[PDB]
Amino acid sequence: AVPPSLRLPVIEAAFPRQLHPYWPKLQETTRTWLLEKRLMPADKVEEYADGLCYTDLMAGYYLGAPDEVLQAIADYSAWFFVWDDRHDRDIVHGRAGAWRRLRGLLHTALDSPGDHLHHEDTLVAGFADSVRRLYAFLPATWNARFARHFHTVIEAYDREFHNRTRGIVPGVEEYLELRRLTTAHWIWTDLLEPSSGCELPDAVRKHPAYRRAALLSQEFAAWYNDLCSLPKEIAGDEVHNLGISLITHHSLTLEEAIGEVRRRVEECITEFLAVERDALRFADELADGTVRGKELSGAVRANVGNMRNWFSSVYWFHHESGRYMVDSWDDRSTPPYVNN
Numbered sequence: 001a002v003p004p005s006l007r008l009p010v011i012e013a014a015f016p017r018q019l020h021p022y023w024p025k026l027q028e029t030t031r032t033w034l035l036e037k038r039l040m041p042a043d044k045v046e047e048y049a050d051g052l053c054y055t056d057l058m059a060g061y062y063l064g065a066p067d068e069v070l071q072a073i074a075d076y077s078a079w080f081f082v083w084d085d086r087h088d089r090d091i092v093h094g095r096a097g098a099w100r101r102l103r104g105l106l107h108t109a110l111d112s113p114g115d116h117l118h119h120e121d122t123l124v125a126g127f128a129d130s131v132r133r134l135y136a137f138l139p140a141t142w143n144a145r146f147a148r149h150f151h152t153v154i155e156a157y158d159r160e161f162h163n164r165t166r167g168i169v170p171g172v173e174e175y176l177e178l179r180r181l182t183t184a185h186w187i188w189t190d191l192l193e194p195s196s197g198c199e200l201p202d203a204v205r206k207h208p209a210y211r212r213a214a215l216l217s218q219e220f221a222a223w224y225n226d227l228c229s230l231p232k233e234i235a236g237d238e239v240h241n242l243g244i245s246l247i248t249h250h251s252l253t254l255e256e257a258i259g260e261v262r263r264r265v266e267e268c269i270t271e272f273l274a275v276e277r278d279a280l281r282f283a284d285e286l287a288d289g290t291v292r293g294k295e296l297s298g299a300v301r302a303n304v305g306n307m308r309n310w311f312s313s314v315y316w317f318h319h320e321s322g323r324y325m326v327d328s329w330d331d332r333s334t335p336p337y338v339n340n
């Protein structure tokens, strides 16, 4: 039963959940990978990993992905959650040097992941393993685009480190721009392509309806995370959340801010529904009778279908995952699954 303040009847009625058939194997394989890569302690893996639902989140999103693609994506996504936790802990403990060094190593590993498979920092080694595997599916031009996007993501995390150390809450537009990077909008969008087996040409993926559908799917993910993760984040002195920007700068109350975030989330859904029609029309137009046209049409259609699936996967993940269950923790500021 979703809390009333978080419930979205449109998602529940009109965005039916999907689950990839590889999910049962995926859950165990990513748990084993977190253990083998030492990304979490063994006892915390055993107690918490399945309950975190990270594999479920990806298996509800990249429908149709080959199993090996989904495995690499799921391992990368679990890594990404552990990195968010590492970042948080470095901020809380004032580890500016450790963060700066990790930031530099991730930029280097992202360009040369094979070189870093056995790095002393298991967080760097786990990143490099997942990225090397993601770089094995499509041409180097796709890999270069993934890297360009993730270099930008690393720098947004650096900006968050400085905001939280200086106590700066970004303004609303500043925040919204930053949040397209800390959510990694363009990484998840890039990953649609190995999932459907096709690197899309710039003229296809930059088509206005493809771009706007992709944007709105990720804005939903970001802002619905903000709505659901607000309690854990207030408890943990996190400053990055649309609700916090609204409270801090527009003098809204917590109740007013939650309402405004919810309204922005709801409008994202119905803006998506409008553009989804145009993006599927474009998929139709690509099927011009040629072999290449059929390939591009089917890839666009699968990708736009997964942009839709992200809404239901994100919605349910926030109510199933132990990541956000702050009421269940003895110390609300220290989630039991992080390394403190």
Ligand SMILES: CC[N+](CC)(CC)Cc1ccccc1
Binding pocket: 077, 080, 081, 084, 182, 183, 184, 221, 222, 225, 314
């Ligand atoms: C792994 C995803 N992420 C940011 C990229 C890491 C903390 C948080 C997130 C979870 C769910 C929806 C949106 C963002």
Ligand SMILES: [Mg+2]
Binding pocket: 084, 088
């Ligand atoms: Mg976080």
Ligand SMILES: [Mg+2]
Binding pocket: 084, 182
């Ligand atoms: Mg974060």
Ligand SMILES: [Mg+2]
Binding pocket: 225, 226, 229, 230, 233
């Ligand atoms: Mg959050």
